Design a protein around this ligand. Structure first.
Ligand SMILES: [Cl-]
Ligand SMILES: [Cu+2]
Ligand SMILES: [Cu+2]
Ligand code: NA
Length: 600
């Protein structure tokens, strides 16, 4: 298995320099050096043909053999995509990690400037990553450009591929459309908490497709070709591509909004399928993204993914300038671009429209009889205050760019981080028996950037999930203690290439999950006030040998149903009809006011 791990690391090494068999016939279309789009139908189709070949490779040795052959001529982004899907899903690869994508393609995570200087200069090279900041959105560069959030977004879309065919794999990805919704909703809620942390208004939806887009220059090179991700200047409008017209996207949106308000979608055979309470968000995520499991691809289209494609190609809509797409084409770079967030707030508003047709939860669904949460305290250096700060890290570039005779080229970057903290929850169990509880913890900003109080129904768009875990409760008083390091949304550990080649990449071998260091928002130098919300629910009603649950909340569980029956984002997914969230609270719910205080 360590021998297996070594041989997988080798498939991913110097993959920008990597570049036939009847199996490999339908693959080799996209040219090496070109940027691979994780969203355009034709790049994804070639990517599926390749991971199909990898999937039906007779045995491990056969998978490595055919892969090694494919990587000599297929596009290298496509290969890393198809190869990560094979390693995640082949039974004979269980227990193996894939190398970190930021070490496979360092040039997607570090500015051209640091790469050029590292390619400019046998001792270790270190490149530390000046100029007027004239863009106010640069205040959130620490967030959008974080190495770990971009790597998480790459990995999530490969655990939950839009081309997944359950009939082919024999396996269903449980509630994949609903987790498409929730995970992108949580990225929006977390981004808006960073915007309010830095004194900015919450982001507006891109819901009018004639509005000019604001610009973003990525400053990322593609060493494989010397091509770069194309910058987008301020002031261009979406234009028709050869494959898709903007007015066709407007049709897809209208037809989806139509069905939400009628309460049923139309399948391919023309029958009506009701958006029930139980499956409606999943059905909607599949036809919105869209995925293979869309009930009617011809009618509802492919709106979210064509959004990425038209936005990534806006500088060269018909290809006449022969310019590569921008960072919105690729899941490992798209969060860098501000417009990612405006597009996903639009897409989140479609799901929000559907959640608004559902009746608010009543007290019977919210209450857990006999459990009463009596107090929550957050324990940190100062109780009920978390401190955030910037910290330095380095990334090894030698496995992905050509090191020559240097032993190591590292680039140093900085990233937000937070002191460790823990929760103590006091719970009175008034029954004469042991209860089992899921503890659900969320964080929500108290005020907006102009000091107004955010009302209960709007905290649905900004409540971020911090944890979900089972505890047992004995009759009487209980204190539940939980540590931040154990959060069910965060990746606890990514072994580097060097780790996996030696045995220091050491079950929990998947790479999806939120970065530990971005568990909580930045806050600000004064101390920004947040509602800390804790709810306990009856685990015998929630509950649905599991690998890859380190980040269960956002990533689900390997080969396993999503282990919580409640709607994703419960209790905050349905309209709350009460103005102040403190009037929402039931006895098994509690809010403690905390502050988050950034240190400059
Ligand atoms: Cl694209
Ligand atoms: Cu995404
Ligand atoms: Cu998107
Ligand atoms: Na975790």
């Amino acid at each position: 298995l360590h021998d297996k791990q070594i041989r997988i690391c080798h498939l991913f090494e110097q993959l920008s320099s990597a570049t036939h068999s009847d199996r490999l016939k339908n693959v080799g279309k996209l040219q090496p050096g070109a940027i691979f789009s994780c969203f355009h139908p034709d790049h994804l189709e070639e990517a599926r043909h390749l991971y199909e070949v990898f999937w039906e490779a007779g045995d491990f040795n056969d998978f490595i053999e055919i892969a090694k052959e494919a990587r000599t001529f297929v596009n290298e982004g496509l290969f890393a995509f198809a190869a990560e899907v094979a390693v995640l899903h082949r039974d004979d690869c269980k227990g193996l990690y894939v190398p970190p994508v930021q070490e496979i393609f360092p040039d997607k995570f570090i500015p051209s400037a640091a790469i050029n200087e590292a390619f400019k200069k046998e001792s270790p090279i270190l490149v530390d990553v000046t100029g007027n900041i004239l863009d106010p959105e640069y205040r959130l560069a620490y967030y959008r450009e974080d190495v770990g959030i971009n790597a998480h977004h790459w990995h999530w879309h490969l655990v939950y591929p839009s081309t997944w065919n359950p009939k082919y794999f024999g396996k269903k990805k449980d509630r994949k459309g609903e987790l498409f919704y929730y995970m992108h909703q949580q990225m929006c809620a977390r981004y808006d908490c960073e915007r309010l942390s830095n004194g900015m208004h919450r982001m507006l939806p891109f819901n009018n497709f004639d509005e000019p887009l604001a610009g973003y220059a990525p400053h990322l090179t593609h060493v494989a070709s010397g091509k770069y991700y194309s910058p987008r200047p301020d002031g261009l409008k979406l234009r028709d591509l050869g494959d898709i017209e903007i007015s066709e996207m407007v049709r897809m949106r209208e037809r989806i909004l139509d069905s939400i308000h009628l309460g049923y979608v139309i399948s391919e055979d023309g029958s009506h399928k009701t958006l029930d309470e139980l499956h409606g968000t999943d059905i909607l995520g599949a036809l919105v993204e869209s995925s293979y499991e869309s009930v009617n691809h011809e009618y509802y289209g492919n709106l979210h993914n064509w959004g990425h494609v038209t936005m990534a190609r806006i500088h060269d809509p018909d290809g006449r300038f022969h310019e590569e797409p921008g960072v919105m084409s690729d899941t490992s770079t798209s969060l860098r671009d501000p417009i990612f967030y405006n597009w996903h707030r639009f897409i989140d508003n479609i799901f929000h429209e559907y959640k608004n047709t559902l009746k608010p939860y009543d007290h019977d669904v919210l209450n857990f009889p006999d459990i009463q949460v009596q107090d929550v305290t957050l324990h940190a250096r100062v109780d009920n205050v978390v401190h955030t700060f910037m910290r330095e890290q380095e990334l090894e570039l030698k496995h992905g760019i050509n090191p020559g005779n240097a032993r190591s080229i590292k680039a140093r970057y900085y990233h937000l981080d937070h002191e460790p903290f823990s929760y103590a929850v006091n719970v009175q169990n008034n029954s004469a028996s042991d209860k089992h509880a899921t503890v659900r913890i969320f964080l929500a900003p108290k005020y907006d950037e102009l000091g107004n109080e955010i009302k209960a129904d709007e905290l649905r768009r900004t409540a971020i999930e911090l944890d979900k875990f089972k505890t047992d409760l004995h009759p009487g008083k209980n204190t539940v203690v939980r540590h931040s390091l154990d959060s069910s949304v965060t990746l606890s550990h990514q072994p580097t290439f060097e780790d996996l080649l030696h045995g220091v990449g050491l079950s929990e071998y998947c790479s999806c999950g939120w970065p530990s260091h971005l568990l909580v928002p930045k806050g600000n130098i004064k101390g920004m006030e947040y509602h800390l919300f804790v709810m306990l629910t009856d685990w015998d009603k929630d509950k649905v040998s599991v690998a890859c649950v380190d980040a269960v909340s956002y990533c689900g569980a390997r080969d396993h149903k999503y282990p919580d029956k409640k709607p994703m984002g419960f209790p905050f997914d349905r309209p709350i009809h009460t103005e102040h969230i403190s009037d929402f609270l039931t006895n098994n719910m509690f809010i403690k006011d905390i502050k988050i205080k950034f240190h400059e």
